[PDB]
Ligand binder design. Structure first.
Ligand SMILES: C[C@H](CCCC(C)(C)O)[C@H]1CC[C@H]2[C@@H]3CC=C4C[C@@H](O)CC[C@]4(C)[C@H]3CC[C@]12C
Ligand SMILES: C[C@H](CCCC(C)(C)O)[C@H]1CC[C@H]2[C@@H]3CC=C4C[C@@H](O)CC[C@]4(C)[C@H]3CC[C@]12C
Lengths: 200, 195
């Protein structure tokens, strides 16, 4: 059985998105067939094995350290930090990069929506000392007590860079890949808890 | 293992197919990246050297008695098709420990400038209620970023007669194909990185 939060049932809701000029929507209104509180617990709850599965579902993510729970707790103002290594295409860049991820709970209301903001640094990529990646993961109620996910991203430039265009695009396209894995791994965790594995 | 098959063009901007999802359809895997040009991946799965597809099938530990795979006839083009068979061992089964799988593949669309659509129709006679359905699985291949290939697989059950196990079969099929598609992707990524 999958973790639950209250309320377990709710009418569809809308996140309070503050889109900016530099922001691109990666995926929008992506449905996940389980109540909001369940999905929030899968990605962000105290059993961090599910988030661990989300990251290692991408073959290119390696050396994933253990994911801590959110402290002080899973609530607005909570945060956590972890790292892993992402293999890249070495013809357009370096063969891999460390990824230093900070997640901050910006808003958490299971009656309405959840906003977890990822701030990520990639020290090994060209111009990696000039920017951080901001990724906003919104979770909200979809139809029939399901969950919709929307992900928005931008580059926070802390210094000027000659790679500005390549980094913003690579970041968007790379995150289409990673969010598609996250959505698929979440859908798999839900469908595996509900049914018997018919092979293997 | 030394050189991979090619088709032209070898380079192209990203494309996306009309996956035409309906209410009875389920996504198996979507937008899975394969780091090789579209014509290369198409040749690996469907080209006349069928050794690569044979390797894809036998990479799945649940597949046994994998016969030689024929090429598409009349040839690899829209309207071409092929037929092959193997046996899939089952896990938490309600019936037998394994089932024969009778596969027909049809090329519904093939344009290396755009996308390729191969539809698999599979019959599993030995499973409970197996005389009431065939499995339809659509494999879409299209251009991803940087001259790579994206794959999307969508599946539904074609019920030819009434069935009371309808719910479990539709779910068992999605779950089993998630497994087999992940094995296919890992073998394809294996073949490309070894080249
Ligand atoms: C900065 C580089 C692009 C560099 C372009 C260059 C220098 C090779 O031309 C991009 C490409 C891949 C991006 C990662 C993809 C996915 C994620 C997961 C998400 O949860 C957190 C952000 C992260 C790690 C992206 C960071 C920026 C990356 C490395
Ligand atoms: C019909 C059964 C599920 C129902 C079994 C029941 C009712 C006993 O639980 C499913 C489970 C495994 C499914 C196969 C998984 C893999 C593939 C490969 C794909 O390329 C072609 C379809 C096929 C053979 C699935 C057929 C349906 C199967 C046997």
């Amino acid at each position: 059985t999958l973790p639950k939060m209250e309320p377990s049932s709710h009418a569809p809701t809308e996140p309070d998105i503050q889109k900016d000029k530099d922001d691109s929507i990666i995926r929008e209104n992506e449905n996940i067939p389980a109540p909001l509180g369940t999905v929030v617990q899968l990605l962000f709850g105290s059993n961090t094995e599910y988030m661990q599965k989300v990251i290692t579902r991408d073959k290119n993510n390696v050396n994933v350290e253990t994911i801590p729970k959110f402290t002080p707790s899973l609530v607005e103002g909570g945060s956590r930090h972890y790292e892993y290594t992402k293999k890249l295409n070495n013809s357009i860049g370096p063969k891999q990069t460390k990824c230093l991820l900070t997640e901050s709970i910006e808003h958490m209301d299971i009656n309405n929506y959840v906003l977890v903001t990822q701030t990520t640094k990639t020290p090994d990529v060209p111009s990696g000392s000039n920017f951080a990646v901001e990724s906003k993961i919104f979770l909200f109620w979809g139809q029939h007590d399901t969950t919709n996910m929307t992900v928005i991203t931008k580059i926070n430039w802390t210094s000027k860079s000659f790679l500005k265009g390549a980094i913003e695009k690579g970041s968007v396209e790379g995150q289409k890949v990673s969010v598609d894995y996250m959505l698929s791994e979440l859908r798999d965790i839900i469908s595996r808890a509900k049914s018997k594995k018919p092979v293997k």
